[PDB]
Design a protein around this ligand. Structure first.
Ligand SMILES: CNC(=O)C[C@H](Cc1ccccc1)NC(=O)[C@@H](Cc1ccc(Cl)cc1Cl)NC(=O)[C@H](N)Cc1ccccc1C#N
Ligand SMILES: CNC(=O)C[C@H](Cc1ccccc1)NC(=O)[C@@H](Cc1ccc(Cl)cc1Cl)NC(=O)[C@H](N)Cc1ccccc1C#N
Lengths: 302, 302
């Protein structure tokens, strides 16, 4: 029993983290086979960061301008290219610790593990959700750019995030591993703003199911609701609309607990309209929205 | 910026997890050099679990009664012994992935990372505090016994916890790696109860400092308090007494933020007496007590 925010074991990713240096700029890279992936703004100086033309900046670089360190071993760069906002450095050595892997671009509401790194060295692991406004609420200091986010599925690592920048509000923005930003953001040092965020409804429902699986039932009621009438209440409280596909995804949890999805929606509706009145759910006084239905099944199996 | 509950990267420990089987009982073990450490109740049958005499049960075992699997490789047991509540199996192969390590017995209020494992295979990582009543609030299913808790200090893994059992209240009890239980618990399948728990005051104060370091100041006030008068309020709200040593430990955070420890104690006193009034601190509506002062410095450096 118990329910905890749980990251994937990070070892398969730790063996891929390296340090990339160009001039005075140092950040983290991901070494898979004989290619190192890192944020392309590693080629920028501080003055370049205002409004860089990256094609221009990269054409002025040669292979020996890039320093790649794996542990205390220096890797020789033998080619370089740019794919969207990621720099790819071909090195002369294949990473012997390369796991089975894929690159995946996730949807808002999905979660992943972040391996926070500094100078190519991992410092900690935590769970994040991609917010509906395509930011994540991470923990990142200077030097963390290039840290990656990932899921693991039967010894296959699915990389889904590379960290690029902190926005003025303190939330974080980044790309998939093919260099495409999540959201409308661009990689230049100007004040960009995230859109207004909303709560991930299907995830809150998953977490309420986790609470029932763990014996917490106080928030249930005898009522049900229609999908349409639930969504009218969702809008008012800044919750994302629940779709029929969300209902279908929650099927397994609904079957395990005996609580129909729209019955749990009636519980959430009442929780939104009256609050918790001092009680907690799985140790929380706020409704939690960073557990997917998959996260719940993975941790609550049985 | 940002503040997240963060585990240590788990890779150095993943390479040590193995599966131990005796009869029909299977659980996790920790393989360091040529010794495998696991909970001694692996030698018990279901009938034995009511009131076992472990010396009696172990004297009836031979080396070949123990099956140790590392990945898809079987390890040969060449000796066995009991140290308190841990079984030690000598195997014919030294673990080539053995990290630099120590065994440490921690105090209540200290935190550690847990690598939850099933059948010798890691499933997830999360942070735990040792509660004042010597339980942890983990996430553990059947088969998780033998999962370990650890801290990492400059590539040295300090193992501090091995999981042994879930209590009726759903909280978790275990031993140090030398087999001594934390708290009054014993390894037999009877209903034992944890003592009443209390809040870890020095940790709440550390987390309030983390909030200030991250720009959250709304809970501060112009008042200060004496240590004695703070502790009178602490008792009333089931908080552990704050000692002068706790004050000293918070020195670095106090110096970084400019807020004297007893000034922050006045903020906590007011938060306990009036609640939050709908506001949050670092995203939480409850006061958090599972970050040590060390945890805060490690994540908020700068
Ligand atoms: C109080 N908030 C801050 O000080 C963060 C500040 C907000 C801001 C941004 C813009 C205008 C005004 C204010 N942003 C940065 O300093 C950015 C600059 C930057 C670099 C490269 C690109 Cl492509 C884009 C950008 Cl915007 N630097 C980074 O994000 C580092 N990679 C890591 C890093 C360094 C320092 C602190 C946090 C983190 C993280 N994570
Ligand atoms: C609703 N709560 C429960 O069902 C848990 C139940 C509470 C209880 C305990 C006692 C009397 C009545 C009720 N405890 C266990 O079933 C224990 C039994 C047990 C084995 C060995 C020793 Cl030395 C001591 C003990 Cl007590 N088994 C384990 O803890 C497994 N190692 C892992 C495990 C299995 C299943 C569920 C959770 C977990 C975990 N973690």
């Amino acid at each position: 029993s118990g329910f905890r925010k749980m990251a994937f074991p990070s070892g398969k990713v730790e063996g891929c983290m390296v340090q990339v240096t160009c001039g005075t700029t140092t950040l983290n890279g991901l070494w898979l086979d004989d290619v190192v992936y890192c944020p392309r703004h590693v080629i920028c100086t501080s003055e370049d960061m205002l409004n860089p033309n990256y094609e221009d900046l990269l054409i002025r670089k040669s292979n020996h301008n890039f320093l790649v360190q794996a542990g205390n071993v220096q890797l020789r760069v033998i080619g370089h290219s740019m794919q969207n906002c990621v720099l790819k450095l071909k090195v002369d050595t294949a990473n012997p610790k390369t796991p089975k892997y894929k690159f995946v671009r996730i949807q808002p509401g999905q979660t992943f593990s972040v391996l926070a790194c500094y100078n190519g060295s991992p410092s900690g692991v935590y769970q994040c959700a991609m917010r509906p406004n395509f930011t994540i609420k991470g923990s990142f200091l200077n030097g963390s750019c290039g840290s990656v986010g990932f899921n693991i599925d039967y010894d296959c690592v699915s990389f889904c995030y590379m960290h690029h920048m902190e926005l003025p509000t303190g939330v974080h923005a980044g790309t998939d591993l093919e260099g495409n930003f999540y959201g409308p953001f661009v990689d230049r040092q100007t004040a960009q703003a995230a859109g207004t965020d909303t709560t991930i409804t299907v995830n809150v429902l998953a977490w309420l199911y986790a609470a029932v699986i763990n014996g917490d039932r106080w928030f249930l009621n005898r009522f049900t609701t229609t999908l349409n009438d639930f969504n009218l209440v969702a809008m008012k409280y800044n919750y994302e609309p629940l779709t029929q596909d969300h209902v279908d995804i929650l099927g397994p949890l609904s079957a395990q607990t005996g609580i129909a999805v729209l019955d749990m929606c009636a519980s959430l509706k009442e929780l939104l309209q009256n609050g918790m009145n001092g009680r907690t759910i799985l140790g929380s006084a706020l409704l939690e929205d960073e557990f997917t239905p998959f996260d719940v099944v993975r941790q609550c199996s049985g």
